[PDB]
Amino acid sequence: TLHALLRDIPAPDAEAMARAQQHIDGLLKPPGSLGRLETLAVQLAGMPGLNGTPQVGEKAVLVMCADHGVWDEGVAVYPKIVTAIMAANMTRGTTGVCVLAAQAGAKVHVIDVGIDAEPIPGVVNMRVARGCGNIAVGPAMSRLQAEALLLEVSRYTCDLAQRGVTLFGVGEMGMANTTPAAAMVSVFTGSDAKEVVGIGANLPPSRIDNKVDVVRRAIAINQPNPRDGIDVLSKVGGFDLVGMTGVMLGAARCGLPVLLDGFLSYSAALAACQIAPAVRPYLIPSHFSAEKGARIALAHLSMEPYLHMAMRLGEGSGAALAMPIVEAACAMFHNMGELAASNIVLP
Amino acid sequence: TLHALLRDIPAPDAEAMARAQQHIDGLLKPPGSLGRLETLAVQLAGMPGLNGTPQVGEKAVLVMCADHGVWDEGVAVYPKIVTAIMAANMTRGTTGVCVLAAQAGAKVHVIDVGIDAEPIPGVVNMRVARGCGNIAVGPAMSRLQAEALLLEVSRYTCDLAQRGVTLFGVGEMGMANTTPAAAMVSVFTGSDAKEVVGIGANLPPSRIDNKVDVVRRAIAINQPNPRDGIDVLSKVGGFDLVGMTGVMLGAARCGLPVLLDGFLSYSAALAACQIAPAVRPYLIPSHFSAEKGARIALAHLSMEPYLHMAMRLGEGSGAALAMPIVEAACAMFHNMGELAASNIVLP
Numbered sequence: 001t002l003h004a005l006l007r008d009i010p011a012p013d014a015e016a017m018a019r020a021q022q023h024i025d026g027l028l029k030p031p032g033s034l035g036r037l038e039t040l041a042v043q044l045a046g047m048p049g050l051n052g053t054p055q056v057g058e059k060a061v062l063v064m065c066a067d068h069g070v071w072d073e074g075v076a077v078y079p080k081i082v083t084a085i086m087a088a089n090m091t092r093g094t095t096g097v098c099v100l101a102a103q104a105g106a107k108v109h110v111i112d113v114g115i116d117a118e119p120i121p122g123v124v125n126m127r128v129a130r131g132c133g134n135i136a137v138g139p140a141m142s143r144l145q146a147e148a149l150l151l152e153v154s155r156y157t158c159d160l161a162q163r164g165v166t167l168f169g170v171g172e173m174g175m176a177n178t179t180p181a182a183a184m185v186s187v188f189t190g191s192d193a194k195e196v197v198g199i200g201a202n203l204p205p206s207r208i209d210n211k212v213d214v215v216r217r218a219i220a221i222n223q224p225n226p227r228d229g230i231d232v233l234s235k236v237g238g239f240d241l242v243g244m245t246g247v248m249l250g251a252a253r254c255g256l257p258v259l260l261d262g263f264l265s266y267s268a269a270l271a272a273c274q275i276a277p278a279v280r281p282y283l284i285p286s287h288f289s290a291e292k293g294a295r296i297a298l299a300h301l302s303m304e305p306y307l308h309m310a311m312r313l314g315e316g317s318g319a320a321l322a323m324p325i326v327e328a329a330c331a332m333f334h335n336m337g338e339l340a341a342s343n344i345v346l347p
Numbered sequence: 348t349l350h351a352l353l354r355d356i357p358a359p360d361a362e363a364m365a366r367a368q369q370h371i372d373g374l375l376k377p378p379g380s381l382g383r384l385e386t387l388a389v390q391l392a393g394m395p396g397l398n399g400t401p402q403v404g405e406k407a408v409l410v411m412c413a414d415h416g417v418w419d420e421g422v423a424v425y426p427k428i429v430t431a432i433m434a435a436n437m438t439r440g441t442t443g444v445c446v447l448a449a450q451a452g453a454k455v456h457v458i459d460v461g462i463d464a465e466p467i468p469g470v471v472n473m474r475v476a477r478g479c480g481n482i483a484v485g486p487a488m489s490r491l492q493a494e495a496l497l498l499e500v501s502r503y504t505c506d507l508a509q510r511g512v513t514l515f516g517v518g519e520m521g522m523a524n525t526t527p528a529a530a531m532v533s534v535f536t537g538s539d540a541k542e543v544v545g546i547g548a549n550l551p552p553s554r555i556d557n558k559v560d561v562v563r564r565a566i567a568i569n570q571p572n573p574r575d576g577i578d579v580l581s582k583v584g585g586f587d588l589v590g591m592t593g594v595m596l597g598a599a600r601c602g603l604p605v606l607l608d609g610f611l612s613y614s615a616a617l618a619a620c621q622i623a624p625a626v627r628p629y630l631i632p633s634h635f636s637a638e639k640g641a642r643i644a645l646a647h648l649s650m651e652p653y654l655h656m657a658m659r660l661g662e663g664s665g666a667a668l669a670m671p672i673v674e675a676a677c678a679m680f681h682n683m684g685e686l687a688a689s690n691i692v693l694p
């Protein structure tokens with residue numbers, strides 16, 4: 001049950017983190033000079049599914065795919081079928097995330113959580129429905145549906161741990177999905193929709209105002225409760241957003257790290273942490289999305305991405321791009337020599 | 348001759364860059380959505396030693412090692428011998444750069460351009476002298492010495508191209524070397540020394556004022572000419588700084604990319620571009636050094652690092668950390684599918 005899942009997320013291991021910190025301070029560099037590699041290495045040390053030390057075994061990027069009824073409100077530039085096309089492309093290795101995952105030695109799990117098309121062979125099927133409801137006139141989904149999906153995705157994710165996955169990245173694919181992401185960001189952070197509605201997949205400037213109105217209308221009609229994340233997800237989110245949330249809950253329950261991606265992933269992360277604050281220490285940022293609301297969303301999570309790529313593709317592409325960074329923190333930790341063995345004293 | 352070298356640096360290939368741009372726009376993503384991977388891929392395309400396309404073959408990080416007489420002015424926290432110790436450690440694979448280079452599949456070339464110790468077996472010997480002169484009372488070196496070293500290093504670097512190196516990173520090791528780097532930054536950018544003098548290798552706050560005075564004194568006594576970079580290097584730089592400059596000149600002459608590292612590398616880069624503006628399109632930033640003057644130096648090069656790690660180790664560690672990013676630009680370019688093959692039309 002979802003209650004049990006949330007309850008049983010482990011706290012970070014303070015003991016391992018102290019040990020990690022002392023090890024790092026003794027490595028063959030001025031103390032603190034590797035900056036955020038150090039802090040990342042200590043963060044990792046504290047994640048119980050890594051067994052007391054910064055390590056990366058196998059890597060999996062989970063790409064949650066779905067369509068949105070709010071497409072019909074004119075907020076997306078690409079035809080609805082692009083979501084289905086791209087999910088099929090994911091099975092052939094031709095996408096941005098696939099290419100960047102291959103570079104990182106990561107496997108990509110393409111999950112259909114609600115594409116409005118025929119099922120795609122070879123894609124993992126968790127489809128709730130053929131696209132979510134149009135958040136401009138009503139809820140994306142029932143609370144039952146959002147709860148079931150979270151629990152489904154969380155279990156899938158934590159099962160990957162038995163196969164030797166120690167690091168996750170989340171991603172999505174869904175035309176129009178920057179609209180619910182913005183709605184959620186607005187609702188969790190209390191920022192006005194005009195501050196958090198971006199151009200998404202190259203929406204023209206003339207169409208922005210409509211998107212802002214649509215976000216405002218979705219929030220007015222649904223009255224999402226900002227202190228109930230599952231309410232927020234179910235009312236003005238999407239199946240993809242819920243899925244990504246589910247990945248974060250599952251990784252956290254497993255005591256393991258998840259790399260965020262971009263703007264969509266930030267919205268999901270806001271929900272994750274609202275639902276369960278104990279998720280927060282397992283989340284690792286990757287890059288700083290070029291999407292307008294990014295700064296606000298990231299500030300509410302108190303996160304500073306490592307990568308400033310002006311990237312806005314989604315798919316988990318940024319998450320993939322950062323996996324080498326996580327690996328570098330571990331290599332630093334395990335493979336550097338020590339000050340003491342060169343007789344270099346702390347000054 | 349150094350005149351011939353500088354003269355014969357090639358301009359970037361506009362034709363290849365246009366072709367690269369059109370290819371990238373047709374890949375299976377919204378145009379522009381990979382942001383700085385795109386721009387990096389096009390920058391690469393234009394470097395003539397890469398043969399018309401973004402590619403990475405073998406990778407080499409060149410770590411220029413030397414000692415500085417200005418050590419005697421109380422501007423560094425670690426004993427002078429640390430430079431020699433660490434260069435020896437570089438031969439054993441135990442250093443930050445070694446570990447990060449191994450992660451990136453890069454080879455590290457440890458070059459002694461003036462360590463004040465006995466020569467270290469296994470280190471490439473280009474030593475100009477046993478440490479440079481104390482920039483507080485006089486020049487670091489003669490102009491002849493700075494010219495000879497540049498030319499030596501440039502040739503070494505471009506020779507690595509015959510062995511299949513297509514990407515370089517620069518680094519250094521030298522106690523006290525953040526003092527001349529600051530002096531050079533102050534002189535090239537016209538910023539007051541107080542704005543560009545950092546804590547280096549954990550210099551305590553009580554000792555900062557002395558370091559600022561020392562930079563001011565070095566500039567007052569030497570009167571470096573900001574419009575003659577070789578003058579600036581020879582008077583208030585260091586053998587390590589000159590060497591790194593030489594790596595940038597050699598890579599540019601070869602038509603090939605070099606990754607910058609941190610603050611030291613920025614100072615060298617300022618010199619490189621002053622000496623030869625045609626170097627600039629070959630330089631690629633890695634990370635944003637935690638050193639105080641970083642922002643100013645980087646602004647004068649109009650550069651925005653990809654990585655915000657709060658890193659201040661040097662050694663070429665950041666340069667190594669970014670090589671996977673360069674590789675990702677190429678993988679994007681070569682391995683993504685195309686919009687047209689999925690019948691997705693530009694909207």
Ligand SMILES: O=C(O)c1ccc[n+]([C@@H]2O[C@H](COP(=O)([O-])O)[C@@H](O)[C@H]2O)c1
Binds near residue numbers: 075078200262264
């Ligand atoms: O992750 C990001 O920051 C990002 C920012 C803008 C757009 N996207 C991607 O483009 C999509 C949605 O844009 P739109 O305009 O349809 O809302 C979708 O499939 C994405 O993952 C992704």
Ligand SMILES: O=C(O)c1ccc[n+]([C@@H]2O[C@H](COP(=O)([O-])O)[C@@H](O)[C@H]2O)c1
Binds near residue numbers: 549550609611636
């Ligand atoms: O690259 C950097 O940004 C960086 C910033 C601060 C210090 N360092 C390193 O620490 C060294 C110099 O610091 P200091 O205080 O002796 O001038 C030297 O060997 C470095 O490469 C390097």
Ligand SMILES: Cc1ccc(O)cc1
Binds near residue numbers: 425
């Ligand atoms: C003490 C020290 C260690 C490494 C290094 O790169 C510089 C200084």
Ligand SMILES: Cc1ccc(O)cc1
Binds near residue numbers: 086314
């Ligand atoms: C057109 C497009 C392509 C890829 C993608 O991830 C989103 C939209």
